[PDB]
Amino acid sequence: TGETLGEKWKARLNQMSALEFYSYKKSGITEVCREEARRALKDGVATGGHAVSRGSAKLRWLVERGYLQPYGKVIDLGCGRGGWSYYAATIRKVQEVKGYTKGGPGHEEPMLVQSYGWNIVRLKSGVDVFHMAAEPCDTLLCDIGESSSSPEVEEARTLRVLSMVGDWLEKRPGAFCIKVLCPYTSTMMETLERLQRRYGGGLVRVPLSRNSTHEMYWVSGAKSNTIKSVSTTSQLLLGRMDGPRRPVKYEEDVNLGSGTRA
């Protein structure tokens, strides 16, 4: 014993055969159709309203449910191509969005499309956020966390993220959404519950997430129990390994429109 359910799921995950993992990573998950979005971005239709990545539909799913209500100044730590930034520009109460990513050889460089509100969005690449000082903001976004086959490695990097956002949350942002890659260890649930008492909010699982990751999102509009919501998600991914394979629930990708904003 000694293992959490999430630590049990990870061990079983690492022991699946090639196809067993292949047919499981998207068994029963929701997924937006990205075929026509890439073809228009590959060609260059910047005013078609196409999302730059799958991150737009994931963040949209959270906002269309009030899991957070962005407004005012928005900071997007780890913007990559800008899926979260280009969607936040379409929110009415949002007035300004600033993005920061690393980019480089093995990372995503920001894309410049013109969906609705593109003129208020800036994406500065080559920025290490862990060495960047925190600014006062209205809403804070963070989608940083690379996957590892080791739960202890995912633990360490997830903790590095939550310490970094500690000074950003200290700038009293009104709303926030922070990616929690590994929330299933004993220390994480201890850590997250400590940050919750202090900064509020709650942990949420997104159906668009693959079953190959235990990531959950720490949003400001939720008030779910720390240990209960994780264990519910740990049991979900475990139950999806045992039974028969399930189809993917496809849905239409988000369209962000076009045009400028004053």
Ligand X SMILES: Nc1ncnc2c1ncn2[C@@H]1O[C@H](CSCC[C@H](N)C(=O)O)[C@@H](O)[C@H]1O
Ligand Y SMILES: Nc1nc2c(ncn2[C@@H]2O[C@H](COP(=O)(O)OP(=O)(O)OP(=O)(O)O)[C@@H](O)[C@H]2O)c(=O)[nH]1
Q: Which residues are annotated as a binding site for GTP?
A: 10-16, 146-152, 210-212
The contacts of residue 235 (CB under 8 Å, 6+ apart) are 5
Is 138 among the residues known to form the active site? Answer: no
Provide the H-helix boundaries in the chain.
5-14, 18-24, 35-43, 55-63, 83-88, 151-170, 186-199, 226-242
The contacts of residue 202 (CB under 8 Å, 6+ apart) are 196, 218, 219, 221, 222, 223, 224, 225, 229
Look at residue 149 and give the partner it binds from ligand X, ligand Y, none, a contact being a CB closer than 5 to 8 Å depending on partner kind. ligand Y
Q: Does residue 154 interact with ligand X by CB under 6 A?
A: no
CA atoms within 13 A of residue 195's CA, in its CB half-sphere: 28
Please answer whether residues 162 and 195 qualify as being in contact, where contact means their C-beta atoms are separated by less than 8 angstroms. Answer: yes
| Minimum distance, C-beta of residue 183 to ligand Y, in the bound complex (Å) | 14
| Minimum distance, C-beta of residue 75 to ligand X, in the bound complex (Å) | 12
Task: List the catalytic residue out of 58, 76, 98, 253.
Answer: 58
Q: Does residue 130 interact with ligand X by CB under 6 A?
A: yes
| Minimum distance, C-beta of residue 168 to ligand Y, in the bound complex (Å) | 25
Q: Does residue 157 interact with ligand Y by CB under 6 A?
A: no
Look at residue 1 and give the partner it binds from ligand X, ligand Y, none, a contact being a CB closer than 5 to 8 Å depending on partner kind. none
Among 59, 67, 77, 55, CA closest to 169: 77
Is 215 among the residues known to form the active site? Answer: yes
Q: Which of 69, 125, 147, 258 binds ligand Y (CB under 6 A)?
A: 147
Instruction: State the catalytic residues.
Output: 58, 143, 179, 215
Residues engaged in binding ligand X (CB under 6 A): 53, 55, 78, 80-81, 83-84, 101-102, 107-108, 127-130, 143-144
